[PDB]
């Protein structure tokens, strides 16, 4: 819808870099811990990127302390200080759901 | 889109059969529901024809039936429905943006009262 595009255009974060599913990204996520605002690094592989415009979300998967953790973000959230692409993965599909069943070595993405 | 009292594979077969018939004969009589589905499929084949390149020829080839329209005589070689679509039909609609077909309402069929139409290229 063209009118919804115009209304939301302002909320689009232009700082967002080009990343694809398969990329390793370091999300600098703002965290309100009690009173003061902290920065908590969440680094993992981009498993999924879905939706359009201000509704677009991506999901980052990492293995923390031998447990898979998936973090889903709005792309244009202002609660992400910085998103940096650490390495470009070589994958063959848009959704890396197969990674949910694989543990280390088997879950390695080749770098480009 | 219409399900024409047919399963998915039956419906694709029907659409391919009628699409080819309309490209080969240029004017066919069928039921209204079938004609209203055929116009969509035939106008997309003619679009591929207008595009003309090998990629579009092969997209059309995946849909059009391997039927012989005629034998021309140069030796005598056959002309296939796909060749007619790309060498005869497509070019005649070079300057016409869309609307390659028209549906004329005919009247109900005796045995089942089905509303019959003429669908024709033009």
């Amino acid at each position: 819808n063209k009118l919804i595009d115009e209304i939301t255009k302002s909320q689009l974060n232009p700082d967002v870099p080009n990343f694809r599913p398969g990329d390793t990204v370091r999300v600098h996520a703002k965290v309100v811990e009690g009173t003061r605002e902290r920065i908590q690094l969440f680094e993992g592989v981009v498993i999924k990127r879905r939706g359009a415009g201000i509704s677009e979300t991506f999901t980052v998967r990492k293995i923390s302390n031998s447990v898979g953790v998936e973090r889903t973000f709005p792309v244009h959230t202002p609660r992400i200080a910085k998103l940096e692409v650490i390495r470009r993965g070589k994958v063959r599909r848009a959704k890396l759901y197969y990674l949910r069943n694989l543990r280390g070595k088997a879950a390695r993405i080749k770098e480009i | 889109y219409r399900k024409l009292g047919r399963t998915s594979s039956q419906r694709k077969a029907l659409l391919r059969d009628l699409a080819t018939d309309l490209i080969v004969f240029e004017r066919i009589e069928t039921t209204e529901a079938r004609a209203k589905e055929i116009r969509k499929v035939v106008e997309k084949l003619i679009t591929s024809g207008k595009k003309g390149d090998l990629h579009a020829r092969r997209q059309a080839a995946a849909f059009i039936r391997h039927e012989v329209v005629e034998v021309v005589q140069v030796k005598n070689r056959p002309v296939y429905a796909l060749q007619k679509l790309f060498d005869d039909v497509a070019p005649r609609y070079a300057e016409r943006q869309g609307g390659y077909t028209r549906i004329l309402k005919k009247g109900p069929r005796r045995g089942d009262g089905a509303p019959m139409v003429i669908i024709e290229l033009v």
């Binding site: 009118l3 209304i7 909320q11 | -």
Partner: protein
């Protein structure tokens, strides 16, 4: 109490200054005009009659044209009355702009819910299925029509029938943003109806 008529454009989301992410419905409300004021002297109640979207002449008739001629405006797609309004506000032929509302204003959205056609008791009334296995031949059925004694079925035995297309009022929606040049209200959450549905936005009765 203020009111306006708009079309539901669709849903999206907006980030608040806080940083929170809220779903919004975009209501486009261009071409609202005041057509007629009803008084206790004339009609027996106070109401302002607002005409919403402009309509091609050939789609109108002479009765309609005469009614909007009194307000020096073109035929209107939708005409609705608002009661509980202050008639001192509103002049006949005056435009009613979305700036009658401000961010934080609590409103009641009224519209016609999406049509679902003929629907069974499971979808229409949220009744329970019978078992799907263990020999059951009862699955998506309405349950007993009632006891034996009153040789008949009582009057609110819920049964299959046409489901949606009813007037619905969602109460206490916050207005998130008001864009005058676009004639757009952003309302937190959802309002009844398909896209392009008429939505009546008025100040919350509560």
């Amino acid at each position: 109490t203020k009111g306006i008529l708009g079309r539901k454009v669709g849903m999206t989301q907006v980030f608040t200054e806080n940083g929170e992410l809220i779903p919004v419905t975009v209501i486009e409300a261009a071409q609202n005009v005041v057509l007629q004021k009803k008084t206790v002297e004339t009609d027996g109640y106070e109401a302002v009659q607002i005409g919403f979207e402009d309509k091609r002449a050939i789609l109108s008739n002479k009765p309609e044209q005469g009614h909007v001629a009194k307000a020096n405006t073109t035929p209107k797609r939708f005409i609705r009355e608002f009661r509980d309004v202050n008639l001192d506000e509103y002049e006949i032929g005056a435009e009613v702009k979305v700036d009658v509302f401000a961010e934080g204003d609590i409103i009641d959205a009224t519209g016609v819910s999406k049509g679902k056609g003929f629907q069974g008791v499971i979808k229409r009334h949220g009744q329970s299925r019978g078992p799907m296995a263990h020999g059951s031949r009862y699955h998506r059925r309405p349950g007993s029509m009632g006891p034996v004694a009153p040789n008949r079925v009582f009057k609110n035995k819920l049964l299959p029938g046409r489901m949606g297309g009813e007037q619905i009022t969602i109460q206490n929606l916050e207005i998130v943003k008001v864009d005058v040049e676009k004639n757009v209200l952003l309302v937190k959450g959802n309002v009844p109806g398909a896209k392009k549905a008429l939505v009546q936005i008025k100040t919350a009765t509560k």
